[PDB]
Amino acid sequence: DVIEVEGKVVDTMPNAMFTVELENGHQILATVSGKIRKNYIRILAGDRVTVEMSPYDLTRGRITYRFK
Amino acid sequence: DVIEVEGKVVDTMPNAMFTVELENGHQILATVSGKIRKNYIRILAGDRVTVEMSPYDLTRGRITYRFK
Amino acid sequence: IEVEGKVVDTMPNAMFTVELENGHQILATVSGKIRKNYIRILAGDRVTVEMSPYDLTRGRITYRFK
Amino acid sequence: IEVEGKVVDTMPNAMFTVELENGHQILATVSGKIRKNYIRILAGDRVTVEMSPYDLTRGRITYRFK
Ligand SMILES: [Zn+2]
Ligand SMILES: [Zn+2]
Ligand SMILES: [Zn+2]
Ligand SMILES: [Zn+2]
C-alpha cells in the first residue's frame, strides 16, 4: 500500500525527480505523478506537495498533489 | 523500516491501544512504546504524539513521543 | 473554497467518507440542494466538497459528478 | 528550549545530523563552549540541542552526554 505525507519541494534534480522535505525535517526522493504532468501543473522549489510513499521504500515517493 | 508521523490522540481503547488522527485526517491504531511507559509519560486524549509506522502495516503504529 | 475528492465510503444518516485530491480523508455530509434533488451518491463517485471552517476533518458535498 | 536527540551523522566543518526524540531530523552546529572544550562528538552520542528560532530544521548542540 502507500501512505501519504506532505512536504516542501527543496531541490530540483535530474529527470524530473525532486527532493521533498517533510514536516519532521526528513528528506525523501520524489517523482511526479502522470496525473500532475498531463494536467499542466508545474512543480517549483518552495512548493507544498502531497507525496505517496511506497511502503517498501521509505526513501522514495511520488508527488500526487500540489497545494495552491 | 519505519516512517514517523505526527498526530492527535482521538480515542482511548482497550489494552493501552490508541486511535491517532494524522494531519491528513487518516486514523491509525497505535500502541505505546515501552520507553514512554517506563518514563512515567501519560498519553491522554487530545495529546499530540509521534508515531512510528510499521511499513508493512500502515494501519497500525507505535507512539514513541508525546509533545509537551 | 471547494475541494475535489472521491467518495470512499457511505455511512448511515447521509454521511460519506471522502478522499480529497490533496490526500486528506474527511467525513462529509450532503448539502441541502443535494438531498432535495434526490442525488444518489455511491462509493467511487467524484464530488466537490465545501470544507468546514470549524472542523478541518469535515465538510459537505456540494456536487456529484456524473 | 532544549530538545534531546541522538547524533546520526557527522558532516564536514563541525556539522552534525541529529535525530531528535520527537522524530525530527535536524542539521546541527556545535556551541562555542563545546568547541573550546574540545568535546569530541561521534555517531550514536546523545546530545541536547538548542533549536534555531529562524530555521526549524537547524540547531546547535549545547551538551554531549558521556
Ligand atoms: Zn513535527
Ligand atoms: Zn494536509
Ligand atoms: Zn488520503
Ligand atoms: Zn526521524
CA of C61 to the centre of ligand 1 (A): 31
* Chain A residues near residue B4 by CB distance under 8 angstroms: 24, 26
Count of C-beta atoms within a 10 Å radius of residue A23: 16
Say how far residue D17 (Cα) sits from the centre of its chain.
Answer: 7
CA of A10 to the centre of ligand 4 (A): 18
CA of B5 to the centre of ligand 4 (A): 9
Q: What are phi and psi of A52, to 5 degrees?
A: -90, 120
As a whole number of angstroms, the distance between CA C1 and CA C3 comes to: 7
Q: Which domain holds residue B30?
A: 1-68
- Whether residue B67 lies within 8 A of chain A, CB to CB, comes out as no
CATH at C29: 2.40.50.140
As a whole number of angstroms, the distance between CA A21 and CA A14 comes to: 17
* Side chain identity at residue C63, one-letter code: Y
Three-state SS for A39-67 is: CCCCCCCCCEEEEEECCCCCCEEEEEEEC
Q: Measuring CA to CA, which residue among C8, C56, C2 is closest to residue C31? A: C2
Residue B8 grid coordinates: 492527535
Q: What are phi and psi of A14, to 5 degrees?
A: -60, -105
- Whether residue A35 lies within 8 A of chain D, CB to CB, comes out as no
Q: Would you list the DSSP string of chain C?
A: -EEEEEEEEEETTTEEEEEETTS-EEEEEE-HHHHHTT----TT-EEEEEE-SS-TTEEEEEEE--
Please give the helix or strand (H or E) that residue A37 lies within, else none: helix A34-37
Alpha helices (H) in chain B, listed in sequence order:
34-37
Residue D14 grid coordinates: 563541525
Alpha helices (H) in D1-66, listed in sequence order:
32-36
Burial class (CB in 10 A: 0-12, 13-18, 19+), D28: buried
In chain A, the number of structural domains is: 1
Burial class (CB in 10 A: 0-12, 13-18, 19+), B40: exposed
- Whether residue B1 lies within 8 A of chain A, CB to CB, comes out as yes
Q: What's the reported resolution, in angstroms, to a tenth?
A: 2.0
